[PDB]
């Protein structure tokens, strides 16, 4: 029969740390070690929470660590062992078809452009991303990208980029452990208001310990924005890899289930009836398996 398992929990791959922010000056980012972090402040307008840079700063210092785990096709809790074996065979067949080539390149793009800087990148005239490869506590290999050249819409190539792509692909395959400290540097302006992820004093801004922060799941949703294989209209760029391709800004869901392009129909075509989809659709399927989920029937 080979039905879908009743429980199909998948862990998140590419675990993001809780991204802080901090303030400082451009051309002092080489000495960006003891930079003072911005703080959530209550201001009476009714009182609301605001976060902004001080007077003697124009650059943000969003820092988070990303861990590439591997074993993307392996579920954490699968009800059926035959379905788990068939799905592992299908994911391994995908790996022999391509060894996490395009997915790691697009994830290296979402690292390379500061899409994790959601609203801290729109008003910035100079955005910079620094990625250190921490291995046994030391910087194995450093990278210093530029989000101005690497656009948020097109999907290009660059040599250090491909180096980051092979590193993320080796992490996703399982041939090693990849831990990347990513520090952003956006010239948002002198004392301009920044946008941390907001907690729910009508509205509060989330922090960790005397220092404002961005949520991990915001960084994860920014990293998942590789999906361009949806039936795109009206000139929309990449969307986040979600089940049934939904975006909150447009209020609509691409990859509609009335079409045969949502993630679950592509899974049941790929691993149950052996109807292998296109290369782009299986790229999207493996990206959704990388992000994790609670997949399964009821």
């Amino acid at each position: 029969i080979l039905s879908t398992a009743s429980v199909l929990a998948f862990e998140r791959k590419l675990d993001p740390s809780d991204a802080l922010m901090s303030a400082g000056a451009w051309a002092q980012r080489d000495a960006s070690q003891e930079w003072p972090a911005v703080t959530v402040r209550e201001k009476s307008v009714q009182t609301v929470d605001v976060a902004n840079l001080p007077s003697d700063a124009d650059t943000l210092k969003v820092r988070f660590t990303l861990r590439v785990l591997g074993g993307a096709g392996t579920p954490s809790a699968c009800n059926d062992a035959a379905y788990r074996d068939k799905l592992l065979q299908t994911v391994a067949t995908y790996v022999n078809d391509q060894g996490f080539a395009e997915l790691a390149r697009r994830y290296a793009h979402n690292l390379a452009n500061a899409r994790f800087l959601w609203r801290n990148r729109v008003g910035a005239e100079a955005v910079e991303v620094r990625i250190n490869h921490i291995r046994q506590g030391e910087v194995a290999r450093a990278w210093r990208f530029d989000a101005l050249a690497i656009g948020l819409r097109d999907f290009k190539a660059d040599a250090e980029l491909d180096a980051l792509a092979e590193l993320i692909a080796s992490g996703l395959s399982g041939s090693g452990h990849v831990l990347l400290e990513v520090v952003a540097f956006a010239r948002i302006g002198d004392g301009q208001e920044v946008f941390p992820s907001q907690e729910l004093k009508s509205k509060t801004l989330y922090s960790v310990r005397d220092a404002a922060a961005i949520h991990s799941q915001k960084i994860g949703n920014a990293l998942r924005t590789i999906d361009t294989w949806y039936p795109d209209e009206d000139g929309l760029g990449p969307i986040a890899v979600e089940p049934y391709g939904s975006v909150t800004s447009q209020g609509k869901a691409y990859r509609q289930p009335k079409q045969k392009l949502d993630f679950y129909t592509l899974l049941d075509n790929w691993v149950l009836r052996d109807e292998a989809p296109a290369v782009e659709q299986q790229h999207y399927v493996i990206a959704n398996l990388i992000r994790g989920g609670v997949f399964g029937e009821a």
């Binding site: 609203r119 729109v122 101005l148 929309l236 986040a240 800004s249």
Partner: protein, 187 residues
Amino acid sequence: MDHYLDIRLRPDPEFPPAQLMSVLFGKLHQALVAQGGDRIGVSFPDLDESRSRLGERLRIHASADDLRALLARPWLEGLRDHLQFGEPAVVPHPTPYRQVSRVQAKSNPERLRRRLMRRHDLSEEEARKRIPDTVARALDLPFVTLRSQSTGQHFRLFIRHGPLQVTAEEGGFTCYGLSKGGFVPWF
């Protein structure tokens, strides 16, 4: 004033287009502060008056050299992903002209009360009896929201397009692209 440039906000899965309009308006305000001049117009081509919606495009009316200096200004960095634009082409000839105005409001009675402390030195109860709480103005016009480097408070800038006349009038433009007496073509 003869040339126009249409900047259309490319849709974003992260932001509704109102914040893109606000960011573009602040960036063009900074560009107009840095450049100087008052022959630079601002319009809204798909301005629907049904729900006071701004639309999804923006129109800039200026000369050839002024628009060339505007594109040569580095204000456009960081906005190429969210916006797309053509070239500073000329406007069509049979185009009726309308004006654009910034209509502010006295939405805070307490601000005017604090003003009247600084002009007549009256008391708080004299301010409350002279100015009640019903003096707040509700304005049903399209608007963008902005913050300033000089004044850190977040302010709303209402934009209103005037009646469609038949000719243009010689007038200047503000740093926001709004008219202090100027006119822009409509097409």
